[PDB]
Design a protein around this nucleic acid. Sequence first.
DNA 1: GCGTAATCTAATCAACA
DNA 2: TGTTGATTAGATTACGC
Length: 135
Amino acid sequence: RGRGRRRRLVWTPSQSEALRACFERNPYPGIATRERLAQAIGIPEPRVQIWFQNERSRQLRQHRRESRPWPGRRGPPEGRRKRTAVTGSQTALLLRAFEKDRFPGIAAREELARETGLPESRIQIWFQNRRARHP
DNA sequence: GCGTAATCTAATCAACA
DNA sequence: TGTTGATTAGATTACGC
């Protein structure tokens, strides 16, 4: 990988309380739920998404260690993020960047956002998918 | 150093031209 | 329908405290 990752966030206690309470309600929130929590506690939705991935990993691993069944999905699955439209010039920017560095740090990713107008979070997924499809 | 946010791979679901 | 964006499980990495 590269270097220069995002500076880790530190949850305030109230933020932790809010994430844990949301998680009780449903450990598989949709984009509508994630954006709703994001705005309630004043952090960007992408940080919320990463915290649910990590909190599920922790719950699964504890359930596993306690030899307990994971409830899993409950209720109707909530809607996904709408698919991001990526123009041909946006794709071109990204492709050039990818040729020089497959593993951009937060620095590189945030300027691509400036340049392409795409969200940094979507750029990060773009590279994940590109790497996994173009060794 | 600990705890865990941030990052990663791989497999898969699914939108859209 | 094929391309590719979005999500998941789970492993790993590297920071703030």
